[PDB]
Coordinates of C-alpha atoms and ligand atoms in Angstrom, one line a residue:
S20 CA 0.0 0.0 0.0
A21 CA 0.9 3.6 -0.6
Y22 CA 1.7 5.1 2.8
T23 CA 4.4 5.4 5.5
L24 CA 3.8 5.4 9.2
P25 CA 5.4 7.6 11.8
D26 CA 7.5 5.6 14.2
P27 CA 6.2 5.6 17.8
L28 CA 9.7 5.0 19.1
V29 CA 11.1 8.2 17.4
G30 CA 10.4 11.3 19.4
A31 CA 9.1 14.5 17.9
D32 CA 12.6 15.9 17.8
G33 CA 14.1 12.9 16.1
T34 CA 15.6 11.1 19.1
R35 CA 15.0 7.4 19.5
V36 CA 13.1 6.1 22.5
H37 CA 15.3 3.3 24.0
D38 CA 13.8 2.7 27.4
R39 CA 10.5 2.4 29.2
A40 CA 11.1 5.6 31.3
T41 CA 11.6 7.8 28.2
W42 CA 8.5 6.2 26.7
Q43 CA 6.3 6.9 29.8
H44 CA 7.5 10.3 30.7
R45 CA 8.4 11.9 27.4
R46 CA 6.9 10.1 24.4
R47 CA 3.5 9.2 25.8
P48 CA 2.7 12.9 26.6
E49 CA 3.9 13.9 23.1
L50 CA 1.5 11.4 21.5
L51 CA -1.4 12.2 23.8
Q52 CA -1.1 15.8 22.9
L53 CA -1.0 15.1 19.1
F54 CA -4.1 12.9 19.3
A55 CA -5.9 15.6 21.5
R56 CA -5.1 18.5 19.2
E57 CA -5.4 16.8 15.8
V58 CA -7.8 13.9 16.1
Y59 CA -10.2 13.7 19.1
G60 CA -10.0 17.2 20.6
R61 CA -8.7 18.1 24.0
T62 CA -10.3 16.6 27.1
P63 CA -10.7 19.8 29.0
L64 CA -10.7 18.3 32.5
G65 CA -10.7 14.9 34.2
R66 CA -12.9 14.4 37.3
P67 CA -15.0 17.5 37.9
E68 CA -15.3 18.7 41.4
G69 CA -18.5 17.8 43.1
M70 CA -19.3 14.5 41.4
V71 CA -22.1 12.8 43.4
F72 CA -22.9 9.1 43.3
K73 CA -26.5 8.1 44.0
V74 CA -27.5 4.4 44.2
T75 CA -31.1 4.6 42.9
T76 CA -32.0 0.9 43.0
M77 CA -30.3 -2.2 44.5
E78 CA -31.5 -5.8 43.9
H79 CA -29.6 -8.6 45.7
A80 CA -31.3 -11.5 43.8
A81 CA -31.4 -10.3 40.2
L82 CA -31.3 -12.8 37.3
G83 CA -32.9 -15.5 39.3
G84 CA -30.4 -15.1 42.1
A85 CA -27.3 -15.1 40.0
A86 CA -26.5 -11.3 40.4
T87 CA -26.7 -8.2 42.5
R88 CA -28.0 -5.4 40.2
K89 CA -27.3 -1.7 41.1
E90 CA -28.4 1.4 39.3
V91 CA -26.3 4.5 40.0
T92 CA -26.8 8.1 39.0
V93 CA -23.4 9.7 38.5
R94 CA -24.1 13.5 38.7
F95 CA -21.3 15.7 37.5
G96 CA -21.8 18.5 40.1
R97 CA -23.4 19.0 43.5
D98 CA -26.4 21.0 42.3
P99 CA -29.3 18.7 41.7
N100 CA -29.7 20.4 38.3
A101 CA -26.3 19.3 37.1
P102 CA -26.0 16.8 34.2
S103 CA -25.6 13.1 35.0
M104 CA -25.3 9.6 33.6
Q105 CA -27.0 6.4 34.6
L106 CA -24.8 3.4 35.3
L107 CA -26.1 -0.1 35.4
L108 CA -24.0 -2.7 37.3
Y109 CA -24.5 -6.5 37.6
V110 CA -22.2 -8.2 40.1
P111 CA -21.9 -12.0 40.3
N112 CA -23.4 -13.2 43.6
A113 CA -21.0 -16.1 43.8
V114 CA -18.1 -13.7 44.2
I115 CA -20.0 -11.4 46.6
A116 CA -21.0 -14.4 48.8
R117 CA -17.3 -15.3 49.2
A118 CA -16.5 -11.8 50.4
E119 CA -14.3 -11.2 47.4
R120 CA -14.3 -8.1 45.1
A121 CA -15.2 -8.8 41.5
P122 CA -13.2 -7.6 38.5
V123 CA -15.3 -5.6 36.0
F124 CA -16.0 -5.3 32.3
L125 CA -17.1 -1.7 31.6
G126 CA -18.4 -0.4 28.2
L127 CA -20.9 2.0 26.8
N128 CA -24.1 0.8 25.0
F129 CA -25.7 2.1 21.9
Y130 CA -29.4 2.3 22.7
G131 CA -29.9 2.5 26.5
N132 CA -29.2 0.4 29.6
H133 CA -32.6 -1.3 29.2
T134 CA -31.4 -2.8 25.9
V135 CA -28.5 -4.8 27.2
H136 CA -30.7 -7.3 29.0
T137 CA -34.5 -8.2 29.0
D138 CA -34.5 -7.7 32.8
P139 CA -37.7 -5.7 33.3
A140 CA -36.4 -3.9 36.4
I141 CA -33.8 -1.9 34.5
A142 CA -34.9 1.7 34.3
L143 CA -36.1 2.6 30.8
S144 CA -34.0 5.4 29.5
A145 CA -36.0 8.6 29.0
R146 CA -33.2 10.2 26.8
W147 CA -33.2 10.6 23.1
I148 CA -32.4 7.5 21.1
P149 CA -31.5 7.2 17.4
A150 CA -34.0 6.0 14.8
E151 CA -31.8 2.9 14.3
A152 CA -32.6 1.7 17.8
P153 CA -34.9 -1.3 17.7
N154 CA -38.5 -0.7 18.9
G155 CA -38.2 3.0 19.5
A156 CA -41.1 5.5 19.1
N157 CA -40.4 9.1 18.3
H158 CA -36.8 8.8 19.5
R159 CA -37.8 7.4 22.9
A160 CA -37.5 3.9 24.2
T161 CA -40.5 1.7 24.5
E162 CA -41.1 -1.4 26.6
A163 CA -40.5 -3.5 23.5
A164 CA -36.9 -2.1 23.4
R165 CA -36.0 -4.1 26.5
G166 CA -33.2 -6.6 25.7
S167 CA -33.1 -5.4 22.1
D168 CA -29.3 -5.3 22.1
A169 CA -28.7 -8.4 24.4
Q170 CA -26.9 -10.2 21.6
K171 CA -23.9 -7.9 22.1
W172 CA -24.0 -8.5 25.9
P173 CA -23.7 -12.0 27.2
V174 CA -24.3 -10.9 30.8
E175 CA -25.0 -14.4 32.3
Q176 CA -21.8 -15.8 30.8
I177 CA -19.6 -12.9 31.9
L178 CA -21.0 -13.2 35.5
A179 CA -20.6 -17.0 35.5
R180 CA -16.9 -16.4 34.6
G181 CA -16.5 -14.2 37.7
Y182 CA -16.7 -10.7 36.3
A183 CA -19.1 -7.8 36.9
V184 CA -20.7 -6.0 34.0
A185 CA -21.0 -2.2 34.1
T186 CA -22.6 -0.1 31.3
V187 CA -23.8 3.4 30.5
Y188 CA -25.8 4.6 27.5
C189 CA -23.5 6.7 25.3
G190 CA -26.3 9.2 24.7
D191 CA -26.3 10.2 28.4
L192 CA -22.9 11.8 27.6
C193 CA -23.4 12.9 24.0
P194 CA -26.4 11.9 21.9
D195 CA -25.2 10.2 18.7
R196 CA -26.5 12.7 16.2
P197 CA -24.7 15.4 14.2
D198 CA -26.0 18.2 16.4
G199 CA -25.6 16.2 19.6
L200 CA -22.7 18.2 21.2
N201 CA -25.0 21.1 21.9
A202 CA -27.1 18.8 24.1
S203 CA -24.1 17.0 25.7
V204 CA -22.2 17.2 28.9
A205 CA -19.6 19.1 26.8
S206 CA -22.1 22.0 26.5
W207 CA -22.4 22.2 30.3
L208 CA -18.7 22.0 31.1
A209 CA -19.2 32.2 26.4
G210 CA -19.5 31.5 22.7
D211 CA -21.4 29.0 20.7
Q212 CA -19.2 27.5 18.0
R213 CA -16.7 25.0 19.4
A214 CA -13.0 25.7 19.0
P215 CA -10.8 24.0 16.4
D216 CA -9.3 21.7 19.1
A217 CA -12.5 21.1 21.0
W218 CA -13.5 17.6 21.8
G219 CA -16.3 15.7 20.0
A220 CA -18.5 12.8 20.9
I221 CA -15.6 10.2 21.0
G222 CA -13.8 12.4 23.6
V223 CA -17.0 12.9 25.6
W224 CA -17.8 9.2 25.5
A225 CA -14.3 8.3 26.7
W226 CA -14.5 10.8 29.5
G227 CA -17.8 9.2 30.7
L228 CA -16.0 5.9 30.9
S229 CA -13.4 7.4 33.2
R230 CA -16.2 8.9 35.3
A231 CA -17.8 5.4 35.5
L232 CA -14.4 4.2 36.8
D233 CA -14.4 7.0 39.4
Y234 CA -17.7 5.5 40.6
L235 CA -16.4 1.9 40.6
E236 CA -13.5 3.0 42.9
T237 CA -16.2 3.7 45.6
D238 CA -18.2 0.5 45.2
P239 CA -17.3 -2.2 47.8
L240 CA -18.5 -5.1 45.6
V241 CA -15.8 -4.5 42.9
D242 CA -12.1 -4.2 42.4
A243 CA -11.6 -1.0 40.4
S244 CA -8.0 -1.8 39.8
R245 CA -9.2 -4.7 37.6
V246 CA -11.4 -3.1 35.1
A247 CA -11.4 -4.1 31.4
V248 CA -12.8 -1.2 29.3
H249 CA -14.4 -2.4 26.0
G250 CA -16.4 -1.1 23.2
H251 CA -17.9 -2.0 19.8
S252 CA -17.4 0.1 16.7
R253 CA -17.8 3.8 17.5
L254 CA -18.0 2.9 21.2
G255 CA -14.7 1.0 20.7
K256 CA -13.1 4.1 19.4
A257 CA -14.2 5.7 22.7
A258 CA -12.9 2.7 24.7
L259 CA -9.4 3.0 23.1
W260 CA -9.2 6.8 23.7
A261 CA -10.4 6.2 27.3
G262 CA -7.8 3.5 27.9
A263 CA -5.0 5.5 26.3
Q264 CA -5.7 8.6 28.3
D265 CA -6.5 6.9 31.6
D266 CA -3.9 4.4 32.7
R267 CA -6.0 3.2 35.6
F268 CA -7.9 1.0 33.1
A269 CA -6.3 -2.4 33.5
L270 CA -7.1 -3.9 30.1
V271 CA -8.5 -2.5 26.9
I272 CA -10.7 -4.2 24.2
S273 CA -11.4 -2.7 20.7
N274 CA -14.1 -4.7 19.0
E275 CA -14.1 -3.6 15.3
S276 CA -13.4 0.1 16.1
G277 CA -12.3 0.9 12.5
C278 CA -11.5 4.4 11.3
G279 CA -10.3 6.6 14.1
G280 CA -10.1 3.6 16.3
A281 CA -7.7 0.7 15.6
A282 CA -7.5 0.9 11.8
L283 CA -4.6 2.8 10.2
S284 CA -5.8 6.0 8.5
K285 CA -2.9 6.3 6.2
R286 CA -4.0 3.0 4.6
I287 CA -6.8 4.3 2.3
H288 CA -9.3 1.5 2.7
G289 CA -12.9 1.3 3.6
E290 CA -14.0 4.3 5.6
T291 CA -11.7 7.3 5.2
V292 CA -11.2 10.5 7.2
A293 CA -13.3 12.5 4.8
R294 CA -16.1 10.0 4.9
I295 CA -16.2 9.8 8.7
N296 CA -16.1 13.5 9.3
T297 CA -18.7 14.2 6.6
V298 CA -21.2 11.7 8.0
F299 CA -20.3 12.2 11.7
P300 CA -19.1 15.8 12.0
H301 CA -19.6 15.6 15.8
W302 CA -17.3 12.6 16.4
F303 CA -13.8 14.2 16.2
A304 CA -12.3 17.6 16.7
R305 CA -12.9 20.1 13.9
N306 CA -9.1 20.0 13.5
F307 CA -9.4 16.4 12.2
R308 CA -11.2 17.7 9.1
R309 CA -7.8 19.2 8.0
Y310 CA -6.9 15.6 7.0
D311 CA -10.0 15.0 4.8
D312 CA -8.5 13.6 1.6
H313 CA -5.1 14.3 3.2
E314 CA -4.3 11.3 5.4
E315 CA -0.6 11.6 4.2
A316 CA -0.4 14.8 6.3
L317 CA -1.5 13.2 9.6
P318 CA 1.4 13.4 12.2
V319 CA 0.2 10.2 13.9
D320 CA -1.6 7.1 13.0
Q321 CA -3.7 4.7 15.0
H322 CA -0.9 2.3 15.8
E323 CA 0.3 5.1 18.1
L324 CA -3.0 5.1 19.9
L325 CA -2.7 1.4 20.5
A326 CA 0.8 2.0 21.7
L327 CA -0.5 4.4 24.4
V328 CA -2.1 1.4 26.1
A329 CA 1.3 -0.3 26.7
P330 CA 2.3 -2.1 28.9
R331 CA -1.3 -2.9 29.8
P332 CA -3.0 -5.7 27.9
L333 CA -4.8 -4.6 24.7
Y334 CA -7.1 -6.7 22.4
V335 CA -7.9 -5.5 18.9
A336 CA -10.4 -7.6 16.9
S337 CA -12.0 -7.6 13.5
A338 CA -14.8 -9.2 11.5
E339 CA -13.9 -10.9 8.2
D340 CA -16.6 -9.2 6.1
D341 CA -16.3 -5.8 7.7
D342 CA -14.4 -4.1 4.9
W343 CA -15.5 -0.6 6.0
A344 CA -13.6 -0.9 9.3
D345 CA -10.6 -2.2 7.3
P346 CA -9.7 -5.5 9.2
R347 CA -6.2 -5.6 7.6
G348 CA -5.7 -2.0 8.7
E349 CA -6.6 -2.9 12.2
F350 CA -4.2 -5.8 12.2
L351 CA -1.4 -3.8 10.7
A352 CA -1.9 -1.1 13.4
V353 CA -1.4 -3.9 16.0
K354 CA 1.8 -4.9 14.3
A355 CA 3.1 -1.3 14.1
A356 CA 2.3 -0.9 17.8
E357 CA 4.0 -4.1 18.8
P358 CA 7.5 -2.6 19.1
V359 CA 6.3 -0.5 22.0
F360 CA 4.7 -3.5 23.7
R361 CA 8.0 -5.4 23.1
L362 CA 10.0 -2.5 24.8
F363 CA 7.9 -3.5 27.8
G364 CA 8.6 -7.2 27.4
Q365 CA 5.2 -8.1 26.0
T366 CA 4.5 -9.9 22.7
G367 CA 2.0 -9.4 19.9
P368 CA 0.7 -11.6 17.1
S369 CA 3.3 -14.1 15.8
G370 CA 2.7 -13.8 12.1
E371 CA 3.3 -10.9 9.7
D372 CA -0.1 -11.5 8.0
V373 CA -3.7 -11.5 9.2
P374 CA -4.3 -14.8 11.2
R375 CA -6.8 -17.3 10.1
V376 CA -10.4 -16.9 11.3
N377 CA -11.1 -17.7 15.0
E378 CA -7.4 -18.2 15.8
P379 CA -6.4 -15.4 18.1
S380 CA -2.7 -14.5 18.0
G381 CA -0.5 -12.6 20.6
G382 CA 0.3 -12.3 24.2
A383 CA -0.7 -9.2 26.2
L384 CA -1.1 -7.6 22.7
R385 CA -3.7 -9.8 21.0
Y386 CA -5.6 -9.9 17.7
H387 CA -8.3 -12.0 16.2
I388 CA -10.6 -11.9 13.2
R389 CA -13.9 -13.9 13.2
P390 CA -16.1 -14.8 10.2
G391 CA -19.1 -12.7 9.4
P392 CA -20.2 -9.0 9.4
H393 CA -19.7 -6.1 11.7
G394 CA -21.0 -6.8 15.1
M395 CA -20.1 -8.2 18.5
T396 CA -20.7 -11.9 18.9
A397 CA -20.5 -14.7 21.4
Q398 CA -17.3 -15.8 19.7
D399 CA -15.7 -12.4 20.3
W400 CA -16.7 -12.5 24.0
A401 CA -15.4 -16.0 24.4
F402 CA -12.0 -14.8 23.3
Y403 CA -12.2 -11.7 25.4
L404 CA -13.0 -13.7 28.5
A405 CA -10.0 -16.0 27.9
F406 CA -7.8 -13.0 27.5
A407 CA -9.0 -11.3 30.7
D408 CA -8.5 -14.6 32.6
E409 CA -4.9 -14.7 31.5
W410 CA -3.9 -11.0 31.4
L411 CA -6.1 -9.0 33.6
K412 CA -4.3 -7.8 36.8
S413 CA -4.6 -10.4 39.5
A414 CA -6.5 -9.9 42.8
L415 CA -2.8 -10.8 44.2
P416 CA 0.6 -9.8 44.5
Ligands
AU507 AU1 -10.0 7.8 11.0
AU508 AU1 -10.0 6.4 8.0
CA509 CA1 -10.1 3.1 6.6
MG510 MG1 -35.0 -12.3 39.0
MG511 MG1 -5.6 1.3 44.0

């Protein structure tokens, strides 16, 4: 292909990065600043002062006794009028009963907390939902929407394997529509047009994931040092940017995150910078639009975003028929990030070409491609659970 990638291990001034300390204290900040200014926009603050956590419901015998279910309003200021998000948490009762804290999978959902499981006790979101959401009515959730996205969320299996499940609807943070930033937590945090380097939806979604982690640190049922942050597609772009910016996340999973997630942009294949910015002008910074039809001018590529997770375990995965996300570009980004993981003594996929379907490859830096179209399937999750068992931080040292 007709591109050349910037080297993560060459600093902005030309000096080679030879050691883990130089990586962590000099090169990581350089790369975080480039992604903030040129791609996602600047995250203007981390935890806001005055965050308030309210447990609104608590069920100790959910899912027929298998789980404790908690709903938590995370309000971003002390005034009752301040914006908030609604977190849903299922915790495996087997782990609670042993008086042990559970590790956690955390990720955003597309259409509302009530869509991840049929469970009729989940609060029905009252927020705007996209027309694509199954069983909506005038952009609001209906009772028939309950469990409408459960295929992406094997809650019972995740719990049986010893992990809690935490989720938040992405639209609590920024509604996924081209004008959504004006009704987002970003609008709350003197003029009206956002600045060239202002964050978009991906940055806002990623920030919400870190705010969910702030909540998890206070919950006695879970171990917030053992959180795997995950996402599918656009929500996987957010998971990657969250895990790169916030090194408290212990493990990061990108399920088919594609353009502006794991796929190289300088490889012109499937979705391009111009296409993503034209269709989704709210997702990235306005500055990213400088690279429409000009990916050769990008000063970073997505292999460097993957490298910002090192040395923490990172899983990138693709679907065989998902040409728009550019599976080969996702794999080649993993290979181009591998030298940074190797600096930290980790290993990535063995081969130099895309592995065969359903044969994951790599150590703490892992890749698989599964048959079929864009989505997030039981096979994806089976592989993610094996990876978390092996590579997620232990309850011990
Ligand atoms: Au992109
Ligand atoms: Au692209
Ligand atoms: Ca592409
Ligand atoms: Mg029940
Ligand atoms: Mg700690």
